[PDB]
From a paper:
Here, we present the near-atomic resolution structure of [name] ([name]), an archaeal virus thriving in extreme salinity. Through single-particle analysis, we obtained near-atomic resolution maps of DNA-filled and empty virions, enabling us to assemble full atomic models of the virus pre- and post-DNA release, including all structural protein components. The full atomic structure revealed that the virus has a length of 1350 Å and an icosahedral head with a diameter of ~600 Å. The tail has a length of 560 Å and terminates into a baseplate with three radiating TFs of ~190 Å in length.
During image processing, we noticed that the sample contained DNA-filled particles as well as those that had already ejected their DNA genomes. The empty structure corresponds to a postinfection state. (C) Cross section of the empty virus, where the [name], tape measure protein, baseplate hub and tail fibers are missing. Instead, a plug-like density appears to cap the [name]. Comparing the portal structures of the DNA-filled and empty capsid shows that the latter has a plug-like density, which is missing in the former. The structure of the PP itself does not show substantial differences between the two states, indicating that large scale conformational changes in this protein are not required to facilitate DNA release. Moreover, the heads of filled and empty viruses show no notable differences, indicating that DNA release does not lead to any structural changes in the head.
Author numbering:
A (entry chain PB): 339 to 436
B (entry chain PC): 31 to 45, 51 to 436
C (entry chain PD): 114 to 436
D (entry chain PE): 226 to 338
E (entry chain PB): 114 to 225
Amino acid sequence: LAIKANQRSFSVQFVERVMRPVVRDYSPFDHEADIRLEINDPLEDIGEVADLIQQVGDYMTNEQVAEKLDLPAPEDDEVADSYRSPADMEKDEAGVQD
Amino acid sequence: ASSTPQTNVDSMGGGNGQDLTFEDLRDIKDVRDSGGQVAQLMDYKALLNFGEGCEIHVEGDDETKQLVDGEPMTLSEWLEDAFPHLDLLVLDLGGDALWYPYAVGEIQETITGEFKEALPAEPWTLMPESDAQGKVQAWHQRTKTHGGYQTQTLPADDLWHIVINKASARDEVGISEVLRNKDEIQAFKQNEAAINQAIELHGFPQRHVKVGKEDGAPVRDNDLRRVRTIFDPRTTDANTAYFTGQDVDVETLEAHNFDYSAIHEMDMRNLTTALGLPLEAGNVGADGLGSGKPAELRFALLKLAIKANQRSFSVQFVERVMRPVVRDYSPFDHEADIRLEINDPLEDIGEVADLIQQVGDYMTNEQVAEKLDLPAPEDDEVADSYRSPADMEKDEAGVQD
Amino acid sequence: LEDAFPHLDLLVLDLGGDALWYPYAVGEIQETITGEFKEALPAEPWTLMPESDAQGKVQAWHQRTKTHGGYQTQTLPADDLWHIVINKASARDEVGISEVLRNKDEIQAFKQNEAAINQAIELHGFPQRHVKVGKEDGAPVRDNDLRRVRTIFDPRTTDANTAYFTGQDVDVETLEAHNFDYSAIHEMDMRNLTTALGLPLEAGNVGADGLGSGKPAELRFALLKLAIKANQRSFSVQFVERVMRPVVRDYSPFDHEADIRLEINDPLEDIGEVADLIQQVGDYMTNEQVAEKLDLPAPEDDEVADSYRSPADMEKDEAGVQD
Amino acid sequence: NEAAINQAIELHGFPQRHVKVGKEDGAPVRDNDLRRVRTIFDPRTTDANTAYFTGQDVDVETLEAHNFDYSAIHEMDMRNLTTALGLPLEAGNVGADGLGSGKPAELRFALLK
Amino acid sequence: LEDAFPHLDLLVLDLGGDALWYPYAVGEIQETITGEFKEALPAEPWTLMPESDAQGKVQAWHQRTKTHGGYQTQTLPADDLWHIVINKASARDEVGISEVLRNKDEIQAFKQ
Ligand SMILES: [Mg+2]
Ligand SMILES: [Mg+2]
Ligand SMILES: [Mg+2]
C-alpha cells in the first residue's frame, strides 16, 4: 500500500508535468490524450497469477489474461477480445474426439 | 413532525468557533510532521482506510447517457473525467480526516466556465464557526505569513468539509483522533526517551579503576589524572594488558540487565490499541493470537473499523462535493444515485477465485466480473448469463466435450 | 423504504453504538420544508432523560444542554421522539441500563491498575545509579561535598563508554531494576475488563492457551455470536416498530401493517464455509435460497429463481449434448 | 477471593522503595529528619533515570514484589464458579490440558448439550 | 512516447530515488542542436531550491553549486524546469518534505 501510494503520486505527476509538455512542444499528437505511466509492483508472484488464470480464465478475455500475465496482447483483435484461450481457438482449426 | 429539529445540541457557546484553538490544530500538525513511530502508525491507518483506491458507480448509469462534448457520456464517464485522480484525493482527504477533526477544501473553476477540481485546504489552518443547531455557518482561517500570522473568514458556501471521527450525529465539527489520544501518545514518547537514556547509562559496562590501599595512603585528583592517562578507554585497544602493584584495582560496572524489550512491547501494545490498529502494525507480536479464531476476530475487527470509516467518508464525499459539482458544472441530474466506493485493502483474490469455482454456477457473468474486479462483458446478453462467457464461446460449434 | 432510509447502515451503527453505551438511543422524525420525510434524526443521548408514568411508559422527555452561559433545559411530549433500548432489566423496563454505568467499578479498577503499572515502570523498571561517598565509620561528607561528586558522576553528561578513576572511599552502587510481572497484571486486568464488557479475551490483544483450538474455541465464538444475535434482534424489532412503521403511516402511500423486517448482517460469517455448504446440499435449495445464503440478488426470472437446479445448469440445457 | 486478589496485587504485586537513614548503632534520626530525606527520594517527583549521591549512612532498600500465583487462584475460583453454575470451564476464559481434545472434549460438550 | 523516453526504467529509478531522499526530484527539458527533443534531463537536487509565491506555487528556481573557488549562484524562471514531489505536508504543498531531514533525529540516534 505504501509503495502503491508513492508510485501513483510519482506517476501522475511525471505524466502531467514532463510527458504532456513534451507531447505539446515536440510531438504531432494531441497532448490532452489519456496518457498513463504505471510502475510495476516489485512483489508480484507470477505463480499466484497463474493459479488465478487457471481458476477464472473462463471469465477473462485473452487481452485481460495477457495483461495480468505481463505478455503482449494477441496478434489478431478477434482472438484478443475472445474469452476462451487462443490455443483452444487454434485447436478448433479442425480437431476431433477430444 | 418537525421542520426545524426540535431537540437541542449541546453547543459550547461559552467557549470564536469550536473549543479547538488554532494552537491545538497546529499541535496535530506537530505530531504528524515529527516522523518516528507514532507518525508512521497513523500513516498506516490512512493507507489501510484509503490507500487501495476507489470506484464510482451510478445506479442506472446507462439511462443517463447524454451528448456532452457533442459526444456520448453517462454520468459515471463524466464524473471519472471530472475527478481523474480521485485515488490520490481520497488518500489525501481520508488521511486528513483521520488526523484532524475534518478534511476541508474548496471548489475551483477554469478561467471561464468549466470545473477545475475539488481543491483541499491545510486543515490545521481552518476552524469552523457553528450556529446554535450545530451547523457550520462560517469558516475562520489563520495562516503563517511575512509577519507572524494573517487572518481570513469565509462564508462556508463554496467550502466543503468531511468528518470521519465525530462525537455523535449532530456533531458537524468532529474530533481529532490525535488530540483524543494525546495523553497516550505523550506516555509512549516519554517511555521511549526513558529507555534510550537507560540504554546509554546501563546497557553497556563501564570501567571503574580504584587506586590506593584500603585504609592506606589517600590518593588526590592529580594522582588520579596520571592513572586515568594509563587506563584511558580512548587510547586502550582490545588486547591491551595491565601490570600493577597490589594497590590498584580494575573494577567494572556491569551492564545492569533490564527488560527494555518487554517495555517496548508494552508501549507499542498501548499505542497501537489506543490508535485502534492491530498489535502487528507496530512490529510486535503475541502468542496464539497469530492463529485460528483468535486471528480471525482481530482481523475481522480491523476490516469492520475500515468499512465504517470508508462508508462514512464515501457518503459524505458524494453528498457534499460530487453532487454540488453535478449541479454547478454538469448537464446531468444531480439527484442521480451516485455511489463512491473505496476498495477493501485486505482482499485475497485467491479466496475470491476459490469462491467463483464453487458457486460461479449461481452468479451472472457481470456479478463474477464485479467480484473478480474486472470490466463487465462486452455484450449485455452474455453479461446477464449465468454460464461462463468462455463456455458460451465454446458453444459456437464444439463437440465430444 | 430503501429510498426513505438511503444510509441506514450508518444510522444503524450510530444508534446501535449509542444504545450499547447509553441506556437508550434517542431521536426525532424530520420533514422537508413542506410535505415529505427528511430523515430519522438522532439526538445526543447524554443530553436527554425520559419521564416514566406509573406503568413505566415514557410519557415525556427532559433535555439539558450546555449553552452560551451554563446549561439550558427543555421538555418534549414524547410523541415525535423515538427511542431504542438494547440493555434492559426486564420487559416493562422502558428506560434501560447503561452497560458502562453497570460496570463502572470494573472500569475504575482497570484504570487504577494501569496507572499503578505505569508509575511502577517509571520507578522500578529501570536501574538507577547510587554513588556512596566517604569511608564507612570514617569522615562525614556534607551536601556541598556531594554536589561536586554529583557533578563528576552526572547521568545527564555521562556517556556509554565513560570510565571512572577513584580513591578507595567512593562506591558506585546500583539500584537494580526490581523485577515484577507487569505483563501478567496487564493480562489479568484485560481479562477482567473484556469479560466484564462481554467481549472475548482476544479483543484486548491478550490470548490464552488451548482456548484458541477445538471445542474450547467453538464455544466462546458461539457465545459471542449468540450475544450479537440477541442485541441485533432486540434493536431490529424495535427500530421497525417505533421508527420505520410511523414513517410508513405518516409519509407513505403503503400499508403500515405490512410485514417489514430489518435484519443486521452477521459480522463473523465465512463465505468459504457457505460456499462449501452450497456444494454439498445445493441440490435441496432453490436458486433464490442459494442467492439469499450467498448474499446475491435473486435471479431475474421467477421461473429459474424457484427452481432447485442451478441457473447455469438451466442455461446449459438451452441445447447442449454429450456432457 | 476476587477482592482478596485485587488487594493483594495492590500491596504485594509492585515493589516499593524503603529508604533507611542513619548508621546502625549510631545517632538516631527523628521524624523531621526523615521529612527532608522523603523530599529528596520522593517517588512522586523522581524519574526513571534519577541518580542518587549519599554519605555511607543512607541505604536505599527495596520491598521486592513478593511472588504469589494469583493466576492459579483465579483459575481455581473460575473452575469453582463455572462448575457450580453448570457451565463448562471454557466459558470463564479458562482452559485445561487434554480436556480440549478427543473423547474428553466430546463428553463435556455432550453434557452441556 | 516509447521512442521519446527509451530508458524510462532508469529515469524513473533515478528521479524516484531523488524524490524519496530529497523534497523533490527536479530537472530540465533538452533538445537536439536544432528541432527535436533530446531527453528529460535531471539536475542535482541538493543544488536547487524553489522560490514560492503567496499561493505556494513555485515561481522561480535558485541554484548554488561548488566551483573553482567556493560556490557560484544561478537563478532560473521555473518555465522550462520540472519537479516531482512524493513526500508533502498536504495538498497545496508544492515544495515537499525530505524523509531524511524529517527523521534526522532518529538517524543520529541509530549512528550514536
Ligand atoms: Mg597518612
Ligand atoms: Mg571526625
Ligand atoms: Mg547519641
